[PDB]
Write a protein that binds this ligand. Structure first.
Ligand SMILES: Nc1ncnc2c1ncn2[C@@H]1O[C@H](CSCC[C@H](N)C(=O)O)[C@@H](O)[C@H]1O
Ligand code: NA
Lengths: 265, 265
């Protein structure tokens, strides 16, 4: 009578950990959600085939409003697994679901999986140098989100890198590209005029981490804003002051302009 | 002609991903390092048995000084794997190993795995709220480093959480315990008297992340400094002001005192 939160990883069904797979194969019921992120390299069918179980996919409403009515009941008498893209607790509100499990007298366990939060290391940017993170959300009607602007500002001032999660509207199959993120951000800069994010700002784009050939690009906004980085998901990063070896990596591996090698210490 | 950087994950031999295992099994040569960290929940023998390949262990010097003459030559005519605890490229000097590969006309691919950077999400603390990260090191001779103290200060000051890695002596398999870290920091607070780390400071301890039964504890230093957190590795976190949901998780899941619901929110 336990509930397992099992992450599926970054790109395809093989990004699940061996631990996660062996446990998932032995659960009586398997649920999952695919709205918190996009696993561009697999399909529900492939996942099901891999674990050898039928997977009942849940919507944001099913989870957020009815988790304790749909999932928890079965966990009281069976072994249940709840699958999610990446790591189940990273940049989601899934952690709170563990509190619901407890209140319903259901023991829960967490099986991690590779997350975009650590995969940023493939950009060559020292991970310990990342500051507060943020999300670039799509404007809705008259509401235009801007919180991410001050986060970048705050981190840049301290010389820290900023990781920017990009928006996703799964039910509409909408996945924000780095290009769309940059356009929205330039519009905010136009309004705030803080010099935080401009055409001369160096940025890094990581697309489809987890795949064997992810797209890793670094350069100035003016040059990258219209570049094609391939299919989603995309993640955007605004570096802070660079170490010599970070700049070297960005140039040698991410195709950045050789001029970023010259750091302004 | 190919070099694979493969992450081993968090704690035991099952923490590698299905993708990492299958690729490792097809490699002609397999190297690994355990100087950046150890896999406390398993052994070299178990990892070797699971992968079914002899694993050549490399020291810090083998990697930093001679990676290109030990690993890369073999990668020119074979498929070589380089295993590391956690997620590849998280250790700050590992990213530059890919530059070395390029220079040697060797292709390299990264296979991700769970990292403590993302696994800490199991503490219920929102990942976007983490700021700069640091490592707590032991004073030595006339050297008394305290940089991590300023990091905690700069983060908390902005409402951000601080992830603290504890000093480790891989070769000797000597880990700094959370208890030792706290004592060291109270000592640092006594010298800088900045009111950053005191008996009243709230902290979180994560031990054996990755195992099915990790130790997750939260509370004030005065009560946790002498508490037994079990076998290493221990990870320490000094949270910034908490979101009521984070605090509730720490109370319900990590045994934190009710008091945090009004004092640290
Ligand atoms: N493989 C990938 N490549 C690039 N960005 C990714 C990604 N996976 C997730 N993201 C980014 O993160 C957003 C989802 S946020 C949820 C993250 C997830 N729990 C994890 O552990 O990774 C996406 O909209 C995208 O901006
Ligand atoms: Na971080």
């Amino acid at each position: 009578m336990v509930l397992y939160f099992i992450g599926l990883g970054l790109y395809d069904e093989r990004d699940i950990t061996v631990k996660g797979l062996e446990i998932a194969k032995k659960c009586d019921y398997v649920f999952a959600e695919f709205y918190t992120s996009l696993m561009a390299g697999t399909t529900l069918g492939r996942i099901q085939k891999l674990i050898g179980k039928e997977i009942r996919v849940l919507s944001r409403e099913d989870v957020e409003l009815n988790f304790e009515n749909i999932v928890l009941p079965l966990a009281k008498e069976n072994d249940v697994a709840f699958l999610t893209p990446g790591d189940p607790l990273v940049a989601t509100t899934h952690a709170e679901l563990r509190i619901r499990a407890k209140r319903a007298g259901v023991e829960s366990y967490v099986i991690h999986a590779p997350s975009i939060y650590s995969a940023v290391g493939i950009t060559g940017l020292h991970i310990y140098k990342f500051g507060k993170s943020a999300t670039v959300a799509y404007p809705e009607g008259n509401w235009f989100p801007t919180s991410y602007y001050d986060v970048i500002k705050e981190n840049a001032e301290r010389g820290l890198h900023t990781l920017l999660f990009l928006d996703i509207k799964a039910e509409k199959r909408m996945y924000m590209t780095a290009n769309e993120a940059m356009e929205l951000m330039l519009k905010v800069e136009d309004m705030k005029k803080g010099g935080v994010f401009t055409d001369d700002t160096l940025v890094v784009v990581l697309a489809r981490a987890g795949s064997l050939n992810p797209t890793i690009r670094a350069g100035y906004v003016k040059d990258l804003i219209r570049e094609d980085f391939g299919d989603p998901p995309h993640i955007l990063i605004v570096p802070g002051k660079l170490h010599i070896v970070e700049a070297e990596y960005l140039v040698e591996i991410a195709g950045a302009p050789r001029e970023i090698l010259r750091v302004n210490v």
